[PDB]
């Protein structure tokens, strides 16, 4: 229903791996969204082909003001197009490099915006990875927004333990993912960081992380209910809004 030629392309937003993603204004109406390019190449290099053809099926049946949205797609010779929701001021991974480590306020909120997030994508039955701050876009009001969902390897670091040992995994595997963000939030780096897999691997099954001076109880009560090793003991999101340092420090 779409094609390239009611767009209007301007400032390049990011230059990726499978593709590029410019500011574009759809010259209909001159509305702002962010519109990627993704190119047959690299993506025909792997399977990804029909891997995130059925994500993008994902993402449209999916609306919420912490879930970035997708407006549609189309198909060109050497790439494909996705429309997507312009988000004003980055991604969380920038605010986190410049800030270094986030506060107590800025962090709950943000754990509360990714429980809504989630708890909405469990009840519309949809199990998410990848979930990091590399994949999540500040609005115009600093309102988090999840994106990508293409993975609906690499870096084990936001992966939890059942994934790893190619064992099973369900709805909990994006508790394991919350606790993981807020120690980064927190802390500045994902509390199973390395050099190498065999290291992370070894850390992340092993579940063993340990906690700055800084970093404090009631944050440490949270992270570490979060990070069991069984996929049970680990509260349902809805518990997690609950939490005495969450409420005490978030914002709604
Ligand atoms: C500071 C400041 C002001 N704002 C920005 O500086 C700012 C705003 C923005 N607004 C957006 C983008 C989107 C879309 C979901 C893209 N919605 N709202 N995006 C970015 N980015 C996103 C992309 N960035 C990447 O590094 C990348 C990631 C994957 C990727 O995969 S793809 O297969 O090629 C290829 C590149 C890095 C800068 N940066």
Redesign the pocket.
């Known amino acids: 229903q779409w094609a390239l030629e009611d767009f209007e392309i301007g400032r390049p937003?990011?230059?990726?791996?499978?593709?590029?993603?410019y500011l574009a204004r759809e010259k209909q109406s001159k509305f702002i969204l962010?519109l990627?390019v993704?190119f047959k190449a690299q993506l025909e290099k792997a399977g990804v082909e029909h891997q995130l053809r059925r994500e993008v099926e994902i993402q449209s049946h999916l609306r919420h003001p912490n879930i970035?949205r997708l407006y549609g797609y189309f198909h060109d010779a050497t790439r494909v197009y996705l429309i997507?929701?312009?988000?004003?001021?980055?991604?969380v991974y920038?605010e986190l490099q410049k800030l270094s480590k986030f506060d107590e306020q800025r962090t709950a909120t943000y754990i509360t915006e990714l429980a809504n997030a989630l708890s909405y994508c469990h009840s519309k039955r949809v199990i998410h990875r990848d979930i990091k701050p590399?994949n999540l876009?500040l609005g115009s009001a600093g309102e988090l927004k999840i994106?990508d969902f293409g993975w609906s390897c690499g870096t084990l670091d936001y992966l939890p333990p059942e994934m790893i040992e190619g064992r099973m995994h369900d709805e909990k595997v994006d508790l394991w993912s919350l606790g993981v963000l807020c120690y980064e939030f927190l802390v500045g780096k994902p509390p199973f960081e390395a050099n190498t897999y065999q290291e992370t691997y070894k850390r992340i099954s092993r579940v063993e992380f340990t906690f700055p001076d800084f970093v404090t109880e009631g944050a440490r009560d949270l992270i570490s209910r979060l990070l069991k090793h069984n996929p049970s003991q680990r509260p349902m999101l809805r518990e997690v809004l609950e939490h005495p340092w969450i409420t005490a420090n978030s914002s709604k």
Do not use: D, Q
Request: aromatic share 8%; proline share 4%.
């Open positions: 937003l990011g230059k990726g791996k499978f593709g590029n993603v962010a990627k993704l970035l997507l929701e312009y988000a004003p001021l980055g991604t920038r590399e876009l994106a």
